[PDB]
Every structure is written in structure tokens, then in C-alpha cells.
């Protein structure tokens, strides 16, 4: 398979794990921080299934890039867990197969982007400008937590055009089956999830629940309790 370079087309993407509308687990099935329980409906995807899926995504990425140098771009803050697990598994897969004449596989890079207040996009993407000129003529793999509206990645890929990057491919942990979706597709996708606001595995509601290990549905009491005053 060739290195993807049609950002938003997901030209050759394998189907993600399909999480059905009624899939999930009650809150007593797994360890949940006691104070979060009253603000969650259910566990949608446990921590362990997320980790197992990311290991397979790392395998899929290694199969595409083989030994070709690429540059992994973490979209902070929500991608932290996903990015961490991808780095772990890509490094292990690459370094386990390496010989003394091998080379490192990837560089690691960070951009902070922000657009949500409560459970809704403001429709403006804030980007913390660190000079990405070092990615000129490089293969770039964007690592993102979730595609929902598709506004973050459409706007971020437009921003990247100025740096004359060789290829842009997208790895995304979750894609949401929402009528808000603008059609933006990733090249590597973990899970297709139902239209509910998820929290956990670094995904927040107004900075709450990033530490929750499982992908869970926040209930209306949680949305009310932690509703933003500002922005
Ligand atoms: N926690 C959480 N849960 C969801 O279901 C979410 N859906 C969208 C978000 C917010 N951050 C996303 C990128 O990190 C925005 C993706 P977009 O709507 O721009 O495609 C989000 N955050
Ligand atoms: Mg967020």
C-alpha cells in the first residue's frame, strides 16, 4: 500500500471497529473513579480494547510506511493517550525488526489546537503557532483523537499547506456517526462510534475526564455540572 496523500479522502483506509448504537458496559463492569460514576451513562469502549486496537493501528501504519522516514504530529490535548500508545507500539514493532544498519522510523511533533466549548464546536480553530518549516518535504502523519464535525482536520490540513510538506496522512482513534460530519475521512481509523459525546482516554468535557481510562458517555447531569462559564 502507498503512503496516503489525499488528506480527508481516506482513499485506501481499512474499515474501523464498528461500535453499535446499543454497544457498551454498565459502570460496575470495570474500575471507574468513584466521583465520575454519577456523571456517566455507561462505558462505550474499555481502556484495554482501545489499547489493543491502537497496537493493530501501529501494525497497519508500519505495513504502509515500512522503513520510510515520517513525522508524527500530535494534536494536543485530546490526542495525548492515542499518540502515547501509537509511539509505544510503532517503536516496539520497528525496533524489534531492526538490524544494526537500520535507521530510526519517525520524528515526533506537537501542535495545540482548540475549537470546542462544552459539547459543541465554536466553528473557529485556534492553533498555537510553532514553526513547522522543519516538515518541508517530509511525510507527515497527523494523530487525532476524534473526527466529529470534521472542521478541525479540514482547517488544520489547510494550515499545513503553507509548509510544503511532501505527504499528509491522518490516523484517528474515533470517528462519530453524526449528521454534523463534513465528510473528512482519516487513512487509519480505530473505531466508528454512535452519536454521543464521549469522555475519557484524554477526551475532555471542559478539561474534566481526561484521566478516565475508558471511553464513556457523559450524562446530562455531567454536562450541566461542568458546563463552561467563559469562552
Ligand atoms: N470529549 C469529546 N468527546 C466528543 O465526542 C467530541 N467530539 C469532538 C470533540 C472535541 N475535539 C475534537 C478534536 O480533538 C474536535 C473534532 P471536530 O468536531 O472538529 O471534527 C469531542 N471531545
Ligand atoms: Mg476537548
Amino acid at each position: 500500500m502507498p503512503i496516503p496523500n489525499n488528506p480527508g479522502a481516506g482513499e485506501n483506509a481499512f474499515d474501523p471497529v464498528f461500535v453499535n448504537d446499543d454497544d457498551g458496559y454498565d459502570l460496575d463492569s470495570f474500575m471507574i473513579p468513584a466521583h465520575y460514576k454519577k456523571y456517566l451513562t455507561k462505558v462505550l469502549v474499555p481502556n484495554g480494547v482501545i489499547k489493543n486496537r491502537i497496537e493493530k493501528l501501529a501494525y497497519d501504519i508500519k505495513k504502509v510506511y515500512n522503513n520510510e522516514e515520517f513525522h508524527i504530529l500530535c494534536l494536543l490535548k485530546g490526542s495525548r493517550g492515542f499518540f502515547t500508545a501509537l509511539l509505544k507500539h510503532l517503536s516496539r514493532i520497528h525496533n524489534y525488526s531492526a538490524v544494526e544498519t537500520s535507521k530510526p522510523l519517525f520524528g515526533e511533533h506537537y501542535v495545540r489546537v482548540k475549537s470546542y466549548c462544552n459539547d459543541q464546536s465554536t466553528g473557529t480553530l485556534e492553533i498555537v503557532s510553532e514553526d513547522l518549516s522543519c516538515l518541508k518535504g517530509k511525510h507527515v502523519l497527523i494523530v487525532e483523537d476524534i473526527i466529529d464535525t470534521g472542521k478541525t482536520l479540514v482547517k488544520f490540513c489547510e494550515y499545513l499547506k503553507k509548509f510544503e510538506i511532501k505527504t499528509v496522512a491522518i490516523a484517528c482513534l474515533f470517528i462519530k456517526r453524526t449528521p454534523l460530519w463534513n465528510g473528512f475521512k482519516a487513512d487509519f481509523v480505530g473505531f466508528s462510534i454512535p452519536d454521543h459525546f464521549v469522555v475519557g482516554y484524554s477526551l475532555d468535557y471542559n478539561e474534566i475526564f481526561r484521566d478516565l481510562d475508558h471511553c464513556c458517555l457523559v450524562n446530562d447531569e455531567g454536562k450541566k455540572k461542568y458546563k463552561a462559564t467563559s469562552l
Side-chain angles (χ1 to χ4, degrees), residues 2-231:
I3 294 170
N5 192 29
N6 193 358
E11 233 154 34
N12 294 299
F14 294 126
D15 293 337
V17 172
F18 195 93
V19 181
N20 297 296
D21 293 352
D22 297 347
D23 278 353
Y25 306 82
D26 63 33
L27 297 176
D28 293 327
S29 294
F30 304 114
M31 299 295 282
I32 304 287
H35 49 109
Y36 286 162
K37 288 190 70 147
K38 69 184 87 73
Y39 301 125
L40 303 176
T41 299
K42 67 184 188 185
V43 174
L44 188 69
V45 192
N47 187 84
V49 181
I50 296 171
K51 287 180 158 179
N52 292 167
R53 182 56 178 156
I54 296 168
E55 185 176 355
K56 183 51 164 55
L57 292 182
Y59 172 88
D60 296 345
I61 291 160
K62 175 65 178 170
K63 257 212 151 264
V64 165
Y65 286 86
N66 194 19
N67 297 319
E68 187 100 328
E69 174 190 342
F70 66 98
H71 290 270
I72 306 176
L73 197 161
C74 182
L75 291 185
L76 294 170
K77 299 186 184 174
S79 304
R80 188 209 64 70
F82 179 33
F83 175 81
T84 300
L86 209 63
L87 256 53
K88 175 182 168 152
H89 291 299
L90 279 173
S91 291
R92 184 184 287 159
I93 294 167
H94 185 68
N95 287 333
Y96 263 25
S97 70
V99 292
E100 53 87 17
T101 54
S102 297
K103 303 176 188 308
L105 181 57
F106 62 80
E108 56 200 66
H109 308 273
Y110 303 87
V111 182
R112 200 273 194 271
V113 305
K114 193 182 171 58
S115 64
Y116 273 55
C117 184
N118 305 319
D119 57 351
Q120 195 168 45
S121 183
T122 63
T124 299
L125 191 69
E126 314 157 33
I127 301 173
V128 175
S129 290
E130 180 177 2
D131 192 333
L132 293 173
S133 64
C134 67
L135 305 179
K136 180 168 183 188
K138 299 304 189 183
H139 297 297
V140 172
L141 179 65
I142 296 174
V143 173
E144 179 61 310
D145 53 351
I146 187 164
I147 291 165
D148 192 330
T149 66
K151 288 153 71 120
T152 297
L153 282 173
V154 160
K155 293 167 182 184
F156 189 67
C157 290
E158 185 59 38
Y159 169 77
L160 282 186
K161 284 186 185 168
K162 84 178 95 296
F163 303 103
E164 299 187 286
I165 293 158
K166 186 157 57 165
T167 66
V168 175
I170 313 293
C172 197
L173 183 50
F174 301 111
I175 65 173
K176 185 183 291 184
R177 301 192 298 275
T178 171
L180 298 183
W181 182 52
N182 67 5
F184 192 105
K185 294 176 177 173
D187 299 292
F188 309 93
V189 185
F191 302 90
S192 170
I193 62 169
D195 188 8
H196 294 110
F197 198 83
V198 294
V199 296
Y201 206 77
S202 303
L203 285 77
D204 70 308
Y205 183 80
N206 300 322
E207 301 307 326
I208 312 301
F209 303 113
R210 294 200 193 273
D211 59 307
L212 173 61
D213 281 338
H214 314 292
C215 175
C216 299
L217 304 196
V218 63
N219 66 18
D220 286 344
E221 273 301 289
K223 286 186 180 185
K224 185 182 89 78
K225 167 67 176 184
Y226 291 117
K227 199 152 209 212
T229 42
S230 63
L231 290 211

